[PDB]
Design a protein around this motif. Structure first.
Motif, PDB file in Angstrom:
ATOM      1  N   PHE B   1       0.871  -1.097   0.127  1.00  0.00           N
ATOM      2  CA  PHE B   1       0.002  -0.245  -0.332  1.00  0.00           C
ATOM      3  C   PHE B   1       0.468   1.650   0.802  1.00  0.00           C
ATOM      4  O   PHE B   1       1.800   1.156   0.291  1.00  0.00           O
ATOM      5  N   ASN B   2       0.276   2.081  -0.879  1.00  0.00           N
ATOM      6  CA  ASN B   2       1.258   3.845  -0.288  1.00  0.00           C
ATOM      7  C   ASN B   2       0.745   4.566   0.870  1.00  0.00           C
ATOM      8  O   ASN B   2       0.404   4.142   1.614  1.00  0.00           O
ATOM      9  N   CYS B   3       1.807   4.808   1.572  1.00  0.00           N
ATOM     10  CA  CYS B   3       2.398   5.342   3.000  1.00  0.00           C
ATOM     11  C   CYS B   3       2.292   7.119   2.388  1.00  0.00           C
ATOM     12  O   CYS B   3       2.784   7.888   3.012  1.00  0.00           O
ATOM     13  N   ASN B   4       2.976   8.155   1.215  1.00  0.00           N
ATOM     14  CA  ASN B   4       3.088   8.486   0.236  1.00  0.00           C
ATOM     15  C   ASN B   4       1.982   9.264   0.453  1.00  0.00           C
ATOM     16  O   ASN B   4       1.368   9.674  -0.625  1.00  0.00           O
ATOM     17  N   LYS B   5       1.530  10.566   0.600  1.00  0.00           N
ATOM     18  CA  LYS B   5       0.458  11.549   0.875  1.00  0.00           C
ATOM     19  C   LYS B   5      -0.010  12.048  -0.037  1.00  0.00           C
ATOM     20  O   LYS B   5      -1.169  12.295  -0.283  1.00  0.00           O
ATOM     21  N   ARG B   6       1.251  12.418  -0.727  1.00  0.00           N
ATOM     22  CA  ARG B   6       1.525  13.093  -1.169  1.00  0.00           C
ATOM     23  C   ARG B   6       1.486  12.800  -3.167  1.00  0.00           C
ATOM     24  O   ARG B   6       0.797  13.625  -3.996  1.00  0.00           O
ATOM     25  N   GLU B   7       1.417  11.610  -2.811  1.00  0.00           N
ATOM     26  CA  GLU B   7       1.498  10.895  -4.399  1.00  0.00           C
ATOM     27  C   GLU B   7       0.337   9.963  -4.239  1.00  0.00           C
ATOM     28  O   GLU B   7       0.267   9.554  -5.432  1.00  0.00           O
ATOM     29  N   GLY B   8      -0.274   9.043  -3.588  1.00  0.00           N
ATOM     30  CA  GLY B   8      -1.444   8.679  -3.460  1.00  0.00           C
ATOM     31  C   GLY B   8      -2.603   8.965  -2.194  1.00  0.00           C
ATOM     32  O   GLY B   8      -2.162   9.302  -1.114  1.00  0.00           O
ATOM     33  N   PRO B   9      -3.732   7.866  -2.235  1.00  0.00           N
ATOM     34  CA  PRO B   9      -4.525   7.681  -1.431  1.00  0.00           C
ATOM     35  C   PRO B   9      -4.203   7.192  -0.684  1.00  0.00           C
ATOM     36  O   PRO B   9      -3.253   6.395  -0.510  1.00  0.00           O
ATOM     37  N   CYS B  10      -4.199   7.362   1.110  1.00  0.00           N
ATOM     38  CA  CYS B  10      -4.187   6.661   1.883  1.00  0.00           C
ATOM     39  C   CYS B  10      -5.301   5.477   2.197  1.00  0.00           C
ATOM     40  O   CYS B  10      -6.480   6.315   2.198  1.00  0.00           O
ATOM     41  N   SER B  11      -5.423   4.222   2.390  1.00  0.00           N
ATOM     42  CA  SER B  11      -6.159   3.038   2.116  1.00  0.00           C
ATOM     43  C   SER B  11      -6.077   2.935   4.172  1.00  0.00           C
ATOM     44  O   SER B  11      -5.491   3.515   4.585  1.00  0.00           O
ATOM     45  N   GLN B  12      -7.503   3.142   4.906  1.00  0.00           N
ATOM     46  CA  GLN B  12      -7.521   2.242   5.818  1.00  0.00           C
ATOM     47  C   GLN B  12      -6.758   1.867   6.205  1.00  0.00           C
ATOM     48  O   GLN B  12      -6.334   2.204   7.664  1.00  0.00           O
ATOM     49  N   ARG B  13      -5.955   0.667   5.969  1.00  0.00           N
ATOM     50  CA  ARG B  13      -4.761  -0.319   6.281  1.00  0.00           C
ATOM     51  C   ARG B  13      -3.587   0.753   6.372  1.00  0.00           C
ATOM     52  O   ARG B  13      -3.177   0.810   7.420  1.00  0.00           O
ATOM     53  N   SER B  14      -3.044   1.732   5.336  1.00  0.00           N
ATOM     54  CA  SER B  14      -2.474   2.293   5.625  1.00  0.00           C
ATOM     55  C   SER B  14      -1.917   3.503   6.576  1.00  0.00           C
ATOM     56  O   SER B  14      -0.879   4.392   6.740  1.00  0.00           O
ATOM     57  N   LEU B  15      -2.818   4.564   6.795  1.00  0.00           N
ATOM     58  CA  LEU B  15      -3.446   4.595   8.136  1.00  0.00           C
ATOM     59  C   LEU B  15      -2.491   4.095   9.696  1.00  0.00           C
ATOM     60  O   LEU B  15      -2.235   5.652  10.385  1.00  0.00           O
ATOM     61  N   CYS B  16      -2.303   3.585   9.683  1.00  0.00           N
ATOM     62  CA  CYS B  16      -2.015   2.218  10.822  1.00  0.00           C
ATOM     63  C   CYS B  16      -0.877   1.189  10.604  1.00  0.00           C
ATOM     64  O   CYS B  16       0.095   1.508  12.149  1.00  0.00           O
ATOM     65  N   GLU B  17      -0.316   0.922   9.633  1.00  0.00           N
ATOM     66  CA  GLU B  17       0.345  -0.045   9.089  1.00  0.00           C
ATOM     67  C   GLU B  17       2.002   0.713   8.767  1.00  0.00           C
ATOM     68  O   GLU B  17       2.840   0.278   8.367  1.00  0.00           O
ATOM     69  N   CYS B  18       1.325   1.837   7.567  1.00  0.00           N
ATOM     70  CA  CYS B  18       3.279   2.950   7.514  1.00  0.00           C
ATOM     71  C   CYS B  18       3.641   3.395   8.622  1.00  0.00           C
ATOM     72  O   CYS B  18       3.344   3.076   9.853  1.00  0.00           O
ATOM     73  N   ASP B  19       4.973   2.879   8.354  1.00  0.00           N
ATOM     74  CA  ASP B  19       5.966   3.037   9.222  1.00  0.00           C
ATOM     75  C   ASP B  19       5.916   4.799  10.090  1.00  0.00           C
ATOM     76  O   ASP B  19       6.021   5.528   9.161  1.00  0.00           O
ATOM     77  N   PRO B  20       5.740   5.410  10.977  1.00  0.00           N
ATOM     78  CA  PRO B  20       5.445   6.268  11.433  1.00  0.00           C
ATOM     79  C   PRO B  20       6.102   7.543  11.943  1.00  0.00           C
ATOM     80  O   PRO B  20       6.779   8.263  11.567  1.00  0.00           O
ATOM     81  N   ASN B  21       7.793   6.469  11.221  1.00  0.00           N
ATOM     82  CA  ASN B  21       8.953   7.223  11.120  1.00  0.00           C
ATOM     83  C   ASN B  21       9.538   7.624   9.929  1.00  0.00           C
ATOM     84  O   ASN B  21      10.668   7.700   9.601  1.00  0.00           O
ATOM     85  N   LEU B  22       9.047   6.680   8.936  1.00  0.00           N
ATOM     86  CA  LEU B  22       9.615   7.541   7.726  1.00  0.00           C
ATOM     87  C   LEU B  22       8.840   8.717   7.939  1.00  0.00           C
ATOM     88  O   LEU B  22       7.846   9.188   7.273  1.00  0.00           O
ATOM     89  N   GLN B  23      10.137   9.486   7.020  1.00  0.00           N
ATOM     90  CA  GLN B  23      10.131  11.159   7.075  1.00  0.00           C
ATOM     91  C   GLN B  23       9.551  11.586   5.970  1.00  0.00           C
ATOM     92  O   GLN B  23      10.477  12.234   5.421  1.00  0.00           O
ATOM     93  N   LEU B  24       8.243  11.379   5.462  1.00  0.00           N
ATOM     94  CA  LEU B  24       7.746  11.858   4.361  1.00  0.00           C
ATOM     95  C   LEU B  24       7.183  13.031   4.447  1.00  0.00           C
ATOM     96  O   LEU B  24       6.106  13.239   5.005  1.00  0.00           O
ATOM     97  N   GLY B  25       6.866  13.949   4.064  1.00  0.00           N
ATOM     98  CA  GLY B  25       7.316  15.391   4.699  1.00  0.00           C
ATOM     99  C   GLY B  25       7.842  16.197   6.185  1.00  0.00           C
ATOM    100  O   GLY B  25       8.490  15.579   6.294  1.00  0.00           O
ATOM    101  N   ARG B  26       8.122  17.344   6.237  1.00  0.00           N
ATOM    102  CA  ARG B  26       8.186  18.163   7.898  1.00  0.00           C
ATOM    103  C   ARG B  26       7.265  17.621   8.891  1.00  0.00           C
ATOM    104  O   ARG B  26       6.013  17.366   8.491  1.00  0.00           O
ATOM    105  N   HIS B  27       8.172  17.346  10.011  1.00  0.00           N
ATOM    106  CA  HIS B  27       7.565  16.660  10.834  1.00  0.00           C
ATOM    107  C   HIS B  27       6.634  17.560  11.618  1.00  0.00           C
ATOM    108  O   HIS B  27       7.306  19.469  11.242  1.00  0.00           O
ATOM    109  N   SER B  28       5.766  17.177  12.442  1.00  0.00           N
ATOM    110  CA  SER B  28       4.362  18.474  13.430  1.00  0.00           C
ATOM    111  C   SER B  28       4.951  17.510  14.643  1.00  0.00           C
ATOM    112  O   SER B  28       4.245  16.868  14.917  1.00  0.00           O
ATOM    113  N   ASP B  29       5.049  18.458  15.848  1.00  0.00           N
ATOM    114  CA  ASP B  29       4.929  18.142  16.957  1.00  0.00           C
ATOM    115  C   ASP B  29       3.136  17.856  17.743  1.00  0.00           C
ATOM    116  O   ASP B  29       3.238  16.776  18.044  1.00  0.00           O
ATOM    117  N   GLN B  30       2.682  18.069  17.168  1.00  0.00           N
ATOM    118  CA  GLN B  30       1.296  18.602  17.570  1.00  0.00           C
ATOM    119  C   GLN B  30       0.200  17.089  16.487  1.00  0.00           C
ATOM    120  O   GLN B  30      -0.695  17.089  16.491  1.00  0.00           O
TER     121      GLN B  30
END
Lengths: 66, 72
Positions: B1-30
């Motif tokens: 599945f896709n994990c890059n929000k800029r390049e395609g949609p996010c499936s319901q699986r991708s919301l939870c299974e994408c590695d949260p440490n993947l540095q896609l876009g700028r970090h936000s503390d909030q």
């Protein structure tokens, strides 16, 4: 269809078709929302509204059409 | 599945299974992210990672509740 991120899932539909002015959760000027009238993403989002996006590019991909 | 929000949609699986440490876009503390190993939503997220959430409640519902209930 659900528009509250706290209360259920957000469909692809909901991301773009939920009214972004629904005051669901705190407002943030670092989130983005889709304006269906202009077919553009704009700054601001209510953080529990399905039509609130983490970046402008996320919103453009999810919702803006040619 | 896709994990890059800029390049395609996010499936319901991708919301939870994408590695949260993947540095896609700028970090936000909030933003928030889901830790699949601990089944817990935690603070911080990368803005263009499908596993980045606008609130703790959004993350809890999508991942701690829905994904955890259904994913197998």
């Amino acid at each position: 269809f659900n528009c509250n991120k706290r209360e259920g899932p957000c469909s692809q539909r909901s991301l773009c078709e939920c009214d972004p002015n629904l005051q669901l959760g705190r407002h943030s000027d670092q989130l983005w929302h889709y304006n269906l009238r202009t077919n553009r993403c704009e700054r601001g989002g209510y953080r529990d509204n399905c039509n609130s996006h983490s970046s402008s590019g996320a919103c453009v991909m999810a919702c803006e059409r040619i």
